[PDB]
Design a protein around this ligand. Structure first.
Ligand SMILES: NC(=O)c1ccc(-n2c(CCC(=O)O)ccc2-c2ccc(F)cc2)cc1
Length: 134
């Protein structure tokens, strides 16, 4: 109970930095990078018992994942990578690791003031995306 309460709700993207380079590092192709980078998703985070659901909705794609913290799952990403994902809570930060083809990327979400800040890291490339409550 009360797992992730400060993350629950509906969030809207308000800024992005370094996201094209992050996607390039991950291996996303040119056309998908351009359309995805233009996207202004809403992110809807909910909890029911031990299950967390994260939906991301935009003109580019609508995605949905549901998971239990610490319990790996298979994910098909917005670029159609088949990845093995594990999401944990570490010190208040939601940490999402995706593994595929001997590669790994981490997406970290944290509450800062009234924002939800998202840090995407692939090797030495980091992108920061900031969301506000809808
Ligand atoms: N639904 C959407 O428009 C959408 C927008 C961005 C992503 N996204 C994030 C978002 C992190 C966050 O901001 O929480 C990290 C990596 C991706 C990605 C992966 C592959 C790809 F080809 C395009 C984007 C995923 C869905």
């Amino acid at each position: 109970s009360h797992m992730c309460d400060a993350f629950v709700g509906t969030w809207k993207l308000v800024s992005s930095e370094n996201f094209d380079d992050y996607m390039k590092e991950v291996g996303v192709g040119f056309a998908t990078r351009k359309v995805a980078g233009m996207a202004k998703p809403n992110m809807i985070i909910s909890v029911n018992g031990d299950v967390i659901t994260i939906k991301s909705e935009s003109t580019f794609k609508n995605t949905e994942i549901s998971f239990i913290l610490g319990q790996e799952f298979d994910e098909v990403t917005a670029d159609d990578r088949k990845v093995k994902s594990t999401i944990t809570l570490d010190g208040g930060v939601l940490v999402h690791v995706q593994k595929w083809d001997g590669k790994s990327t981490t997406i970290k979400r944290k509450r800062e003031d009234d924002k939800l800040v998202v840090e995407c890291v692939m090797k030495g490339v980091t992108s920061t995306r900031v969301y506000e409550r809808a």
